[PDB]
Design an enzyme around this catalytic site. Structure first.
Site, PDB file in Angstrom:
ATOM      1  N   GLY A  32      41.522  31.489 -20.966  1.00  0.00           N
ATOM      2  CA  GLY A  32      42.708  30.718 -21.417  1.00  0.00           C
ATOM      3  C   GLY A  32      42.965  29.392 -20.811  1.00  0.00           C
ATOM      4  O   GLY A  32      43.727  28.652 -21.017  1.00  0.00           O
ATOM      5  N   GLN A  33      41.851  29.154 -20.023  1.00  0.00           N
ATOM      6  CA  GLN A  33      41.612  27.586 -19.404  1.00  0.00           C
ATOM      7  C   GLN A  33      41.365  26.600 -20.724  1.00  0.00           C
ATOM      8  O   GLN A  33      41.009  26.647 -21.707  1.00  0.00           O
ATOM      9  N   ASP A  34      42.242  25.269 -20.509  1.00  0.00           N
ATOM     10  CA  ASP A  34      42.224  24.323 -21.304  1.00  0.00           C
ATOM     11  C   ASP A  34      40.933  23.840 -21.928  1.00  0.00           C
ATOM     12  O   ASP A  34      40.831  23.717 -23.259  1.00  0.00           O
TER      13      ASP A  34
END
Lengths: 181, 167
Positions: free
Chosen positions: B56-58
């Site tokens: 879920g990191q940018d």
């Protein structure tokens, strides 16, 4: 390369079988728990026996200093934890902790917590500010829990060694081990 | 056994990887932020769920699109304690739900970390995510604690019943 450690003997204390040793953080004291049910405090600078606690007639397998409270906490084969004031030699508290032999005691460095491990396959957390209430029981070993140690980098984690051939790492607040080695 | 492909997505630190391994191993895995994906097969009621936990990191959120194809169920994991990023989680969920490849995908929302004292309840998360605005989509929200495992099996039981009735 061979580390040339200069190894000097500071103290030699002959006694009955020593089952646990601990060092006081500020005083030049060594705690020694004996198989005859006594606990001895030695001054390693003067080489003298300073204090002796007669705990019971049964082996004392675990003893620890609680320097912040002036206490010695002992765990004996009588299933009793006994807390002594090391200045007055008075027994502050006594309770049955486990249904079998107490093998190890770990004192939490900052919180009012003691972890105890036993031949009953359980690890128990005791809170002394809550009148020594059992705050948590850690279940999951299938044999005697021989030693427990708190992680010095994360005091919410501890590891346990058992005769079940496993090492379990636990977290305070979890009934289940984080992992098994 | 019916095989079902499930995509599990959400913001970083939402506890996606903890949910995945709690379902598979029964244990709490201390997870570092997932750099990429994990894939695990979970069996429940004679359905084999292949769950894809995508990070879920940018930097990884743009890559979620590559996993939309052949996704039958979408699990969106929200940190119910992260009040600041709830709007970001809403935008990312709405952007995913606009994709045509996910049109027929069943949505399960896990309101995770309900064990935390400042956690938003499942109703507050439902309003903040705008789930009631979704038309023509089967969705369910389940309050979950990934550490205890509470609510995880109720969410899977809903998902299994929905995916069983869709054929």
């Amino acid at each position: 390369m061979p580390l040339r450690l200069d190894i000097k003997r500071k103290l030699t204390a002959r006694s009955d079988r020593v089952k646990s040793v601990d060092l006081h953080p500020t005083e030049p004291w060594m705690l020694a728990s004996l198989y005859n049910g006594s606990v001895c405090v030695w001054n390693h600078e003067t080489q003298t026996l300073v204090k002796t606690f007669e705990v019971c007639d049964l082996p004392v397998r675990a003893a620890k200093f609680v320097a912040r409270k002036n206490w010695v906490v002992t765990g004996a084969d009588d299933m009793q934890i006994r807390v002594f004031n090391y200045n007055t030699l008075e027994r502050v508290h006594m309770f049955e902790a486990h249904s079998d032999y107490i093998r190890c005691i770990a004192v939490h460095p900052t919180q009012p917590f003691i972890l105890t491990s036993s031949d009953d396959m359980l690890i128990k957390l005791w809170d002394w500010d809550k009148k020594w209430s059992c705050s948590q029981v850690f279940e999951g070993h299938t044999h005697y829990v021989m030693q427990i140690v708190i992680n010095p980098k994360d005091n919410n984690q501890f590891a346990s060694a058992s005769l079940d051939r496993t090492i379990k790492v636990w977290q305070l607040g979890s009934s289940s081990p984080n992992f098994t080695l | 056994k019916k095989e079902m492909r499930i995509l599990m997505v959400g913001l970083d630190a939402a506890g996606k990887t903890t949910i995945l391994y709690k379902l598979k191993l029964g244990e709490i895995v201390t997870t570092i932020p997932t750099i990429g994906f994990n894939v695990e097969t979970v069996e429940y009621k004679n359905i084999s769920f292949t769950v894809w936990d995508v990070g879920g990191q940018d930097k990884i959120r743009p890559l979620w699109r590559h996993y939309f194809q052949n996704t039958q169920g979408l699990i969106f994991v929200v940190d119910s304690n992260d009040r600041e990023r709830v709007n970001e989680a809403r935008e990312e969920l709405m952007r995913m739900l606009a994709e045509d490849e996910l049109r027929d995908a069943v949505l399960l929302v896990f309101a995770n970390k309900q064990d935390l004292p400042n956690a938003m309840n499942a109703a507050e998360i439902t309003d903040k995510l705008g789930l009631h605005s979704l038309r023509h989509r089967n969705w369910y929200i389940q309050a979950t604690c990934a550490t205890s495992g509470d609510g995880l099996y109720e969410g899977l039981d809903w998902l299994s019943n929905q995916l069983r009735n869709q054929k």
